[PDB]
Design a protein around this nucleic acid. Sequence first.
RNA 1: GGCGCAUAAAGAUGAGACGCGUUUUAGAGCUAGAAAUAGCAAGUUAAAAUAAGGCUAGUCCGUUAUCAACUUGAAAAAGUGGCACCGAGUCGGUGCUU
DNA 2: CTAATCGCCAGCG
DNA 3: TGCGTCTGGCGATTAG
DNA 4: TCTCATCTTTATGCGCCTACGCA
Length: 1112
Amino acid sequence: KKYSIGLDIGTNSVGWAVITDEYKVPSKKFKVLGNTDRHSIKKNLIGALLFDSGETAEATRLKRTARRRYTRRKNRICYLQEIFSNEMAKVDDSFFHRLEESFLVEEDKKHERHPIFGNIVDEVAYHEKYPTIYHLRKKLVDSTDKADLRLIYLALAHMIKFRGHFLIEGDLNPDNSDVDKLFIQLVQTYNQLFEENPINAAKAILSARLSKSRRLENLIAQLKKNGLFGNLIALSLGLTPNFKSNFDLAEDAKLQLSKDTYDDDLDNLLAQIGDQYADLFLAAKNLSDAILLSDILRVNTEITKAPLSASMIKRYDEHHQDLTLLKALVRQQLPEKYKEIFFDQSKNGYAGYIDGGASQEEFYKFIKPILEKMDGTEELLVKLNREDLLRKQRTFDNGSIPHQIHLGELHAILRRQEDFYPFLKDNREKIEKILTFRIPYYVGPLARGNSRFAWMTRKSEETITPWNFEEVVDKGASAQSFIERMTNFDKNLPNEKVLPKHSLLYEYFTVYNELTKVKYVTEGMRKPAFLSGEQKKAIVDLLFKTNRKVTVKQLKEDYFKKIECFDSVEISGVEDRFNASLGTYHDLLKIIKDKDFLDNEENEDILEDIVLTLTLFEDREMIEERLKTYAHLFDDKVMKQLKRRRYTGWGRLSRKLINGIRDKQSGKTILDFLKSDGFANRNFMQLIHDDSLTFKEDIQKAQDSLHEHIANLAGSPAIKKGILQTVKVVDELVKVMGRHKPENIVIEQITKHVAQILDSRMNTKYDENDKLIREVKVITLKSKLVSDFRKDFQFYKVREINNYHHAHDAYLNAVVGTALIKKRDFATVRKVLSMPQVNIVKKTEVQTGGFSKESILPKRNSDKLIARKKDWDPKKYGGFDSPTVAYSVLVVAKVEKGKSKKLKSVKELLGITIMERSSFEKNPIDFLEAKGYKEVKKDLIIKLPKYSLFELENGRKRMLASAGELQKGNELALPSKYVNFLYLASHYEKLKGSPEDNEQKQLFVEQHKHYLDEIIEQISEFSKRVILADANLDKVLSAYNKHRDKPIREQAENIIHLFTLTNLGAPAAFKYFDTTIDRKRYTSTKEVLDATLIHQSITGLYETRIDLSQLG
RNA sequence: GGCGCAUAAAGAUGAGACGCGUUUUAGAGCUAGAAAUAGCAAGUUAAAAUAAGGCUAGUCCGUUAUCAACUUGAAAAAGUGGCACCGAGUCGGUGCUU
DNA sequence: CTAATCGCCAGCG
DNA sequence: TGCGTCTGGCGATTAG
DNA sequence: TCTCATCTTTATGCGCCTACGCA
């Protein structure tokens, strides 16, 4: 018999149904293997399948990059120690040894506990002399005496370990340090350059803690937005720039100094308007420098050389003095809340700030009403209102510090002490290279083959220190392979790489493809005609070689005086402007300035290589090294202006698809047929589908399992899981029907890929004409159709009752698609929409991910603390807790339960965590007997992943969730009249239909009132049978019996809220009217060792029962 | 249904870097008493680790995706379960057949 | 001398 | 013969 | 939090290409 399959896809659910021709659902009995006595089970062919949602890979990329950064930081400190070791060995031998075991407790140390100086009096003398590290940095920068070697190492290691960002470009110095002098200098040189209308006329006018747009508004309004001065102000502040109509150039190009391509961009935009304006943009960049050094560096730059250390010690001394002032004020005026502020670690006072765990914002919010309701707090409220009160040094807002500040302080320290230590003067540039070096973003991970993310290549066989980096890795080939490993292959000749977007061949192809299918009508012509090859040649040689953006008005105005000799010409086929344009031709004509050289056909490859070289590389020395092979072709100024050009973009076709293959009947190419065709003017995607030329056979002569094709699809990783489960389910239930392929596959992006993969997987036979025999038929539907079919005949759906709605919607879209294709049945539909047996299957899975929670808890006496290293005991060092279990094992053996080591055959669960599962899979009996068990049964070990299944007495079903945890497994089968009554009573206000029909429905709801009591009886019987949660059941029945006088709609909403008591899955909480009923959690797995484990198939039709009472 | 060009929004994938946060230790607490405790001074910083670890020993890799049971296999993979009819509280019964 | 139950918590800009 | 497509772990507490 | 590179999809405008039921 014929049969059809219907599906309904989601991101957490797949619903499947099998119908015959008369819209029924075939029941069938199945063979059950195992150890019990049930050997046949009658089941219906309708069901669903549930799984948790898939995850993307963004959460695991950041951890990988963080691991790489921590490894490289440790290696930086190792390089510095390897430098200082030989000179440190003469003054204090075990200094690095004391520095590297500082974490251990006093028992586990092997030296003195004071790491820096060894003894105790030198340690307290050092800590009284320098209260922070910044006092030491200012003392080493400013003074001129020979300091101790350990203090120099400590300062250098502190400024290498934390070294600021690299977002600024070029170089800078803190010599400016003034927002007023630079602004006056910029106004002076603007009045020197432009003298027709000068600037109308500092520190706090541009250094406010507000938005950049409002800062630009109050800075420009006090003295327009389309002005050159205003846009230069927005460029210096860092806002969105524009240079379209102010400079009046020929190309609308912005200029943001924060981005990468700015210096060559400024050098290109300089000569486009004049040899002037150089010192103007230099002063604008210097103002953009000095505004960034304002809000982070507030100190007199003439008093001290190192400004950051001075700013830090200013903040520290300010904190100290207003701490003493606040202590005196709170002790005097309000002597009752003193212990709450300066002693209590629980609240958000000062003790919660420093010693507790409070932030700055919560501390200021707590201390605001205390500081307001007092007397004598005038400056403190101002400092709190500008958020500079009681501040720390290492804060959350030091992300603005550039690396040049630490570089300048390091250079000053190395310049000051180099006379007393010779090897410091010998190795200054080595340590400066240690600080300043970073791996470029196109080289990548410096592997040696065993990575799967690396692409770099080497030129030698040695180790890559930061000093010999440029003489080991080839940077040109690595920077080429960084791009070339990601670009698309051609979708017609899959052994060829695509062209750059701005190559001249690609632009010729697009302009001839757009050109050759346009039509024109003159005054007196009969029919619209195409253009000849001479006409297209005149279009290319005259128009497109001068102006890029061509409107149709320019095309009409050119030839009507020029060559057309006709004024009543309408050009049909083009909407008011073109799309393709020879932009690279125009740019190289502005650069190279020789039209006859670009017109020569013998220079095609030698220029397309230049376009490829300008598309790939970004570093200027690489482009110079790869354009040095063209030195005897142009002038010096041409090569000087040539490497400033930069392009980005990759097209869709290869060079072989436009100039490589040949039509063997005629000997011409595709591009030649675009240029000169004949009296057809055919184009691309018409010249390869025609059977005249040989291009169809050539593209056909240039040509994967299920998982590889699923991974070859494009989308979020949730829908890949969804369509893979869909394909597995439909193949399984094709197999279960005697291996007869179905007739119709009705489905409901999700659909647009599964339709193609199902049509490719089902139909495989060919006819005598080598045509695809449509043995099946894949039909796709829209959701509004099944929604209208649900809502017009009162087939109402309530989402919160159970999980049968997936399978019921699958069956419903199946029957409406089959009845639509084909054209007392409603009795059959209402009969099968109340079947009490649907195969719901939660997909079991082995859990994986992180090892535990990431919070590092402090020490306590308990033994649920996972150690953080090998030799760090958790009772003395803290550690993580709450690990995640991968799967459980069912073990049965003897354990030493007795003072005389008495044996006792026990049987229990055991959670294997994610951290130790490899050691369990390697040697199971040795690890399991090191756990504490003895004399185990080597064959009776059963794996149990998350979401297993267990059948109990009277139909009780529980799903395993952890070592000790269970979840509800059964599903409530409510009759259809109660579902219709609940949907109608829930939607009492929103009618959405006919008003007289709504009045009849309201009279129906008013006629049926005891259905609430019947539903309460139903769910109380169900919860007394399978849930065993009598306390919360008592609470909800008392809450129903109390407020049993409400309106019908509010009562219906409160009833359909409380179905979270009985539905499948994890327990949750709910609220009836005001009483909130907490979730009840089953935390015992003692009963589960006397039940029947069910090994269930993918659709749940094949089963394998296992009686666990017969084991052990 | 699928391509090419033009404009726009959204998202994915892969590198390179900053700043915090957390845990132990070091920053000698004083005074009155026999303590239990009380008043008192303080406080801003640093070292180390940041998934346990692995061998292929790299300035590399370690949280993504795939996964019911049983039988072959190193693996990709392959194979393993009768059909109608009457009914329905999580599926039951009858007949034919092996 | 052990099992249920209540309440809290979970790396980020 | 042409036409549109949050839920599990953990401590404190209580029940026994 | 910041810099960089390559892809996909969705929506309008402009050219066409081909399977397949229905007018």
